[PDB]
Write an enzyme that holds these catalytic residues in place. Structure first.
Site, PDB file in Angstrom:
ATOM      1  CE1 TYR A  57      24.100  46.827 127.015  1.00  0.00           C
ATOM      2  CE2 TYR A  57      22.611  47.372 125.172  1.00  0.00           C
ATOM      3  CZ  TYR A  57      23.785  47.608 125.896  1.00  0.00           C
ATOM      4  OH  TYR A  57      24.641  48.591 125.502  1.00  0.00           O
ATOM      5  CD  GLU A 112      23.957  48.958 121.941  1.00  0.00           C
ATOM      6  OE1 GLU A 112      24.056  49.821 122.877  1.00  0.00           O
ATOM      7  OE2 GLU A 112      23.275  49.130 120.875  1.00  0.00           O
TER       8      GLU A 112
END
Ligand SMILES: CC(C)(COP(=O)(O)OP(=O)(O)OC[C@H]1O[C@@H](n2cnc3c(N)ncnc32)[C@H](O)[C@@H]1OP(=O)(O)O)[C@@H](O)C(=O)NCCC(=O)NCCS
Ligand SMILES: CC(C)(COP(=O)(O)OP(=O)(O)OC[C@H]1O[C@@H](n2cnc3c(N)ncnc32)[C@H](O)[C@@H]1OP(=O)(O)O)[C@@H](O)C(=O)NCCC(=O)NCCS
Lengths: 287, 388, 388, 287
Positions: free
Chosen positions: C109, C197
């Protein structure tokens, strides 16, 4: 003494590189408390019997070092210095030459805001004879003593060191602030440390052409320095608007000549000496 | 490093800053052909050399015929231009900038440098265009206005307007000036410049700002990340020995004198020149032996120092460094034979094996004195050029 | 404003960041033709909607035949996708992203937002890719690593390396990660993003970092200087009433409830919704009458609020503003007749002519109560929807 | 009172624009010491009987103003604010809405480094009833008094003002810190001023969804605020991840709900009130 002493724990950024290796061996041999080094990509290995870390924060967490000496090539210095500031290092000695002025411009603002002390770049470092050596100056001409030395130049400093050792005066601490246009620390910063250091009884200020640090230091000395100061400025015979080796050794816009600097120092009451061979003699005078 | 005016103007154009229509020409033919490409004359023709004062030296002329452009070009190309900013040998003229004449209403000054005292990029503007800015600074300080770029924010429009209003500009000139400020400040930061000087920054009779001249200096330390600027270097503008020295990791700067100085350390190099000067000598050069005093490097140093015919003696002052004094002495000895150094060489060595190195010099039999200390080394090289 | 995944990936590509080869398609034909343009299957086909959770909702599938790509496209185009991040009505699927399948070794991530607590752009990385990052934050804090961009210096490589090493990356993955960090940080600053993101930022079996998904949020306040981003807005992804309100200088957000709220002030609007909720009511919307409560603006407000069939009453709470209460009352009255407001309207007015405005409401004869104070206004609109 | 008083001299940036004109007339009518304004290009003219300057430095030199109120459109705000900081202004009230977050990010760092106080942006301003009004809040519902009010919202503040006036308590100073994600001043900054202001006897804190300023303010209040504090948070019924009008009224990453804020305040001992209509009642309680 100032800046460093026998207790200063030091890490070296660029520790596994040629100069980092070479000068770290020298520091280790002198007794400097090198506790480790940083080289992205070589964390977890050991070098000169010390741990190598991938980052300065790993280095700091592992060793508690408060000082970092940087031997990282100019293109990566800003990155190195900012990494050190960010990892909590309180004293950075950047030996690296050729750091873009604009990089130092930004780094200098960071250093000041973060309350981090940096000596350099493009300097030989710092040495408190007998206790600590960070940088490239030879510790074999030094002698624990009472003279504090600040200089924009490596080699000239060595001359002054030789003379203050030869006269038995010795050095409290030698600080090479470097030859760049925007250093991390200038004369006034170091002068204030020497003035406030009991062990320093006299100060040798070594400057050269370019900028106005010496002139400002003069005004500062007059008003805030009581210890005797002997000064020497190199470049009386230097042409204008030409870099004399050091990126910062250039007389820009006709300002910053050696004569103007000598003059400003004399006015502030500093004992100037026209020949670099007479620094020891001048100290004997005021001591 | 310095850029030519035509190069500063191409850069300005890339940043939407305004400059006269013009062409950099390497032959009289290109120069004359520029006339019609520019349009109706007259035309300004300018020798391209890094130094300033080209005007006073005859290198800038307004002509009104293709014949005159060509003559000017024939006159200057391949010839050297001497200005009060070059040495008496001048700089080669390999380019002639031919540009549109500009109708000047007012001459202003806009420039920037890294100010070491405030540790900021400082822009400076004045209504005193066409004058050496330093003069204006001495005599009429109150006429110079300045702003410091804030490293945290980058250049801001209000700074541009501040200077514009202090210059008494109004109306569209304020926006134009602001634009030029923002662009020039942007170029300064993006191209790692050390210096910008638009003298004169002209308000045209038609009422627009235009950069009539342009002097740009790049930060040599940032060239590794300025590929375009790297390619623009013009070595012909400098003493070729400088680049020779540099490629050998030596810092060389020629001077008037006759006592060559080979020293390790910039500060020591300058100090050594000074001590020679103090003792009645005349230093011929600054040569900082930046790299390890190897046999080859020292040989190069001599080749370079002695390429100047005025040198009658060479003073070598080495204090420390990575090589031991005895190996430096072998280097000096070797260099002296190989370069066929025909002048007396005085050497001052300090550090490991200083006296063994001195003995080595003494025993080579070459004309090389190993001095005892700096003052002594100075007096001896000075003495060595007495009557030569 | 939100961008589609395919748009985030085009942006990434423009910044040299890596993403799977892919095509955004508006017809099944384009989707099937993407197969051969991409190469050997299988292929990932993805409904493009701003909301996340498209996978769990069936909007992301790996297929291995052109026939399957086309079927998927026929199945979703022009249809709405409901995910746990959309309301039950979902978002229209007008684009299907068809991209190369990726051989996943590990899911990471990498993301960034403006952290209001430290007042910095903060990048966050974790080895916990493919999970909602919030979950990972709750349960495994020690697995999230962060760095704050320093406004004075811009993103620095060491920050990228810091995150890379904390993720235990090594070798070329460290440089790749650093590169992605520097690029993403650069995009964040240059495009005035509010959010980045990459979930998951994938280490491929072949050993390279690749952005498998991409969620970008732009700072709406900076759109005036982000022309490219401005053009990328996709209104279909949002309740069309929001843009309608906005073009009328009204801030509208629909809710579940049945009591419409028209208030001047965002804080007062939310507080008004809350006081209605506190008194047994169910707010139908947030509507901040940002502009001057003009007759036209208030009319629009009603049109917008009442375009939702669940609304059984409208509470109007105006406190101050540029218009006087009596002129606001004339606006409410006018809006009520013209919009043919068919529901009871309760009004709370404060400021100049509050009671004359209240009298005006009372005397219009329209079904509009002029309440005495906030609590009273709340109770009355609540009462007004009892059994409706 | 805090921030401003009858002696505060104020200039207005964007003074000749619609809102700058309109609200300056309002400030003038209230007795605020507007001494001038700044509008690039209109220096040398006069407006509302005050001088108009091309730059803030001209304005400051001419008037000695220490406070500036900004009504400049968002695209030019960063420029405006930095110009004010640079001209020596010590207090900036930025009314402007829509300033890019990244701009405020940088400005906030500047403000803090320069020691300049900024209220805003996207706020209604500041008012010390009876003495000074800078901003857009109506001075006709205020009453010189003892309650200090801080709020992320304009309109809600007015409710609290009405209630504290209606209960006779009155206001020492009202500060609308604005609804943006990165304001110039947050709750803690204002709370500390109220705590240290003799005239402020009670504080009303008005927050809303998003960020964690209220939670931090809570922890701060617990440990450093002794005066009673009544708080109210709007947005209990607001959805997550949706901007509720104010750029900063958005619950990002599930954090910053009204309930979490209410809870944090209660724990720190703040008197919270679930209905905004009960702020006056709650004050009466703790006074
Ligand atoms: C800084 C300097 C000495 C480096 O030279 P060097 O040691 O030969 O260069 P090297 O490549 O051998 O070493 C650089 C090391 O830094 C490492 N490094 C690079 N970026 C780094 C970073 N951000 N952090 C830490 N280390 C880093 C490199 O990886 C390399 O180590 P490695 O060889 O183990 O991979 C040189 O560029 C220089 O500035 N010389 C002049 C010094 C001087 O004259 N000072 C004046 C004093 S008077
Ligand atoms: C700031 C704002 C009010 C400006 O609106 P406005 O007054 O209609 O805009 P105008 O164009 O009339 O006025 C702007 C003025 O600023 C001037 N200006 C622009 N840049 C400037 C600068 N750097 N310095 C000074 N003035 C500047 C413009 O020239 C213009 O003046 P002019 O008309 O005399 O040329 C508006 O954009 C806004 O933010 N509104 C929302 C306010 C709000 O809701 N706050 C919440 C409080 S609860």
């Amino acid at each position: 003494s100032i800046l460093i002493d026998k207790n200063t724990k030091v890490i070296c950024q660029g520790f596994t590189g040629s100069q980092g290796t070479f000068h770290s061996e020298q520091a280790i041999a002198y007794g400097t408390k090198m506790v480790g080094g940083v080289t992205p990509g070589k964390g977890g290995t050991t070098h000169l019997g010390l741990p190598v870390f991938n980052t300065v924060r790993e280095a700091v967490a592992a060793t508690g070092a408060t000082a970092s000496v940087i031997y990282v090539p100019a293109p990566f210095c800003k990155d190195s210095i900012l990494e050190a500031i960010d990892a909590g290092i309180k004293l950075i000695i950047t030996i690296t030459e050729g750091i873009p002025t604009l990089d130092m411009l930004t780094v200098k603002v960071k250093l000041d805001e973060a309350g981090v002390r940096m000596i350099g770049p493009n300097c030989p470092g710092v040495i408190t004879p007998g206790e600590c050596k960070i940088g490239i100056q030879p510790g074999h001409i030094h002698k624990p003593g009472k003279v504090g030395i600040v200089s924009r130049s490596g080699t000239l400093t060595y001359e002054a060191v030789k003379q203050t050792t030869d006269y038995g005066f010795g050095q409290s601490t030698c600080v090479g602030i470097g030859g760049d246009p925007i250093p991390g620390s200038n004369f006034i910063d170091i002068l204030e440390m020497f003035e406030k250091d009991p062990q320093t009884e006299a100060i040798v200020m070594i400057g050269e052409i370019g900028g106005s640090a010496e002139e400002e230091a003069a005004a500062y000395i007059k008003e805030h320095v009581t210890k005797p100061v002997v000064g020497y400025i190199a470049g009386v015979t230097a042409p204008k608007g030409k870099r004399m080796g050091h990126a910062g050794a250039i007389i820009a816009g006709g300002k910053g000549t050696a004569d103007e600097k000598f003059a400003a120092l004399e006015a502030a009451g500093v004992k100037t000496v026209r020949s670099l061979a007479d620094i020891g003699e001048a100290l004997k005078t005021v001591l | 490093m310095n850029l030519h005016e035509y190069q500063a103007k191409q850069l300005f154009a890339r940043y939407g800053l305004p400059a006269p229509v013009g062409y950099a020409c390497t032959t009289p033919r290109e120069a004359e052909e520029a006339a019609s490409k520019i349009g109706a004359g007259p035309w300004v023709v300018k020798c391209q050399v890094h130094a300033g004062g080209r005007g006073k030296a005859g290198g800038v002329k307004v002509v009104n015929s293709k014949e005159d452009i060509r003559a000017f070009a024939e006159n200057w190309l391949g010839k050297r231009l001497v200005t009060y900013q070059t040495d008496a040998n001048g700089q080669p003229v390999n380019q002639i900038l031919v540009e549109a004449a500009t109708d000047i209403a007012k001459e202003l000054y806009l420039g920037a440098v890294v100010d070491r005292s405030s540790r900021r990029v400082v822009f400076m503007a004045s209504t005193e265009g066409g004058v050496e800015i330093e003069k204006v600074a001495e005599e009429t300080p109150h006429l110079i206005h300045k702003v410091a770029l804030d490293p945290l924010t980058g250049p801001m429009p209000y700074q541009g307007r501040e200077l514009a209003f202090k210059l008494g500009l109004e109306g569209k000139l304020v926006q134009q000036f602001t634009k030029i400020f923002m662009g020039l400040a942007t170029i300064f930061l993006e191209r790692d410049l050390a210096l910008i000087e638009i003298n004169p920054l002209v308000i045209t009779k038609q009422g627009d700002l235009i950069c009539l001249d342009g002097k740009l200096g790049a930060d040599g330390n940032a060239l590794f990340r300025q590929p375009d600027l790297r390619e623009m270097r013009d070595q012909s503008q400098e003493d070729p020995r400088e680049a020779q020295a540099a490629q050998w990791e030596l810092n060389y700067v020629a001077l008037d004198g006759n006592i060559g100085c080979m020293v390790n350390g910039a500060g020591l190099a300058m100090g050594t020149m000074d001590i020679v000067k103090l003792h009645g000598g005349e230093p011929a050069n600054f040569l900082d032996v930046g790299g390890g005093a190897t046999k080859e490097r020292v040989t190069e140093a001599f080749k370079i120092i002695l390429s100047d015919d005025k040198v009658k003696a060479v003073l070598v002052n080495i204090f420390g460094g990575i090589v031991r004094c005895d190996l430096i002495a072998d280097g000096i000895i070797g260099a002296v034979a190989e370069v066929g150094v025909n002048v007396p060489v005085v050497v001052r060595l300090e550090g490991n094996n200083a006296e063994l190195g001195a003995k080595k010099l003494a025993d080579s039999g070459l004309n090389i004195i190993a001095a005892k200390g700096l003052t002594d080394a100075a007096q001896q090289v000075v003495a060595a050029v007495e009557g030569k």
